Structure 1
Amino acid sequence: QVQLRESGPSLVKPSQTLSLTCTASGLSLSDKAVGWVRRAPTKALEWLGSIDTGSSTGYNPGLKSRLSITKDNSRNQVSLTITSVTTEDSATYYCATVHQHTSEKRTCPRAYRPDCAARWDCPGGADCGYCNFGAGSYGRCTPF
């Protein structure tokens, strides 16, 4: 139940740099990072990029030229900067909690394993070789 707040100007003009900020305080937004989103009018969901503690900002490519952010930890405040609004870009700015952290790797094929190829072909970039004795999709070995 970490203490969050959404903050910024409410009645503003289009075609400017959205300058909307939030205060997200407990550990669930401090090992996890800050979230930036809105929803459009009578439409489906909307999402805006976000930053963890690493200082690594990233945004959805849809508006890349007119999206830009940063992060601050001392004042429990983070900043959002979205340039060049359009009239179609109308929704709620109240949510800023982005708990999500990236991680990516794919597990090996039905008969394949890490060093169970330590046998047929051992040296190379493709390490996840082949287990059950017999013709396999890639009988020698594969890369992930």
Structure 2
Amino acid sequence: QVQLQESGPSLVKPSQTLSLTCTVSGLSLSDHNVGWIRQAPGKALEWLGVIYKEGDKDYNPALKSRLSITKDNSKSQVSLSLSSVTTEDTATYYCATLGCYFVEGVGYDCTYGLQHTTFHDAWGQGLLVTVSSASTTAPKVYPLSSCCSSTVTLGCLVSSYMPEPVTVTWNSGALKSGVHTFPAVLQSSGLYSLSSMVTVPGTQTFTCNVAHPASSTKVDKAVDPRC
């Protein structure tokens, strides 16, 4: 009955400090335990730590006091900082509530990703953070035409950007039928590229709207279907 959203930079330099925010919506943090869990590419889940509603904390001993978790009840935000990062810290980071319940004949217990009292799902979305020396690079956006009586399929190429992610809409969100946006590839340049394709069978216009939050850039591209 709850929403948690992770936010912060997707790229951190080696030996520097990774910081993230968990913004909680529709609860008071005075009444909720909130914790952090990460998943490295391909591998196990690892617990980072938790801040209880009473204000005390617990941390994973395996992170060697590199962790700090704080909260601001007034702003509905929980903060995480992890110092001296290496490539071992490249992972997807989740916030979640630690919700407690009575187990019949046993006592009280708690589970991460569960809201107390209502027992609804209470996981954040997850945010990938990559530890890397690479510089931020805004994408170049190119129109795609299959015109090389034809049935015409068109698109936008979002070329040579860093880091992930980017968002694509068409006609400021109005066009959705026949839209397929593909996951990105990493090219030998060391930069990402992805494509969005529109398949439609007139007065119709086609404009792709690309956003790259890491570079605070937005690009609108008109694409011509005709031949």
Superposition TM-score, scaled by structure 1 size: 0.62
Cα deviation per residue 1:3-59 (whole Å; 9 max; x = unaligned)?
Answer: 221111112212222211110122386522222121111111111101022110221
Q: In proportion to residue count, which structure has more strand?
A: 2
Cα deviation per residue 1:58-88 (whole Å; 9 max; x = unaligned)?
Answer: 2100013211111111111111111111212
Alpha-carbon distance in 2 for matches of 1:87, 1:48: 16
Alpha-carbon distance in 2 for matches of 1:47, 1:61: 10
* Percent of aligned positions that are identical: 70
Helix, strand or coil: the match of 1:54? coil
Helix, strand or coil: the match of 2:81? strand
Alpha-carbon distance in 1 for matches of 2:29, 2:96: 7
Alpha-carbon distance in 1 for matches of 2:29, 2:95: 10
Aligned length: 104
Residue 50 of structure 1 corresponds to which residue in structure 2?
A: 50
Gaps of at least 5 residues in structure 2 are: 107-227
Q: Is the 8 A contact 1:69 1:80 kept in 2?
A: yes
Alpha-carbon distance in 2 for matches of 1:21, 1:89: 17
Residue 14 of structure 1 corresponds to which residue in structure 2?
A: 14
Q: Is the 8 A contact 1:29 1:99 kept in 2?
A: no
What are the within-5 Å matches in structure 2 for residues 115-126 of structure 1? none
Residue 24 of structure 2 corresponds to which residue in structure 1?
A: 24
Gaps of at least 5 residues in structure 1 are: 108-144
What are the within-5 Å matches in structure 2 for residues 18-97 of structure 1? 18-27=18-27, 30-93=30-93, 95-97=94-96
Larger RCO (CA within 8 A; separation ≥ 6): 1
Amino acid at match of 1:36: W
| Structure 1 ranges of 4+ moved more than 4 A | none
Alpha-carbon distance in 2 for matches of 1:3, 1:89: 25
Helix, strand or coil: the match of 2:63? helix
Residue 99 of structure 1 corresponds to which residue in structure 2?
A: 98
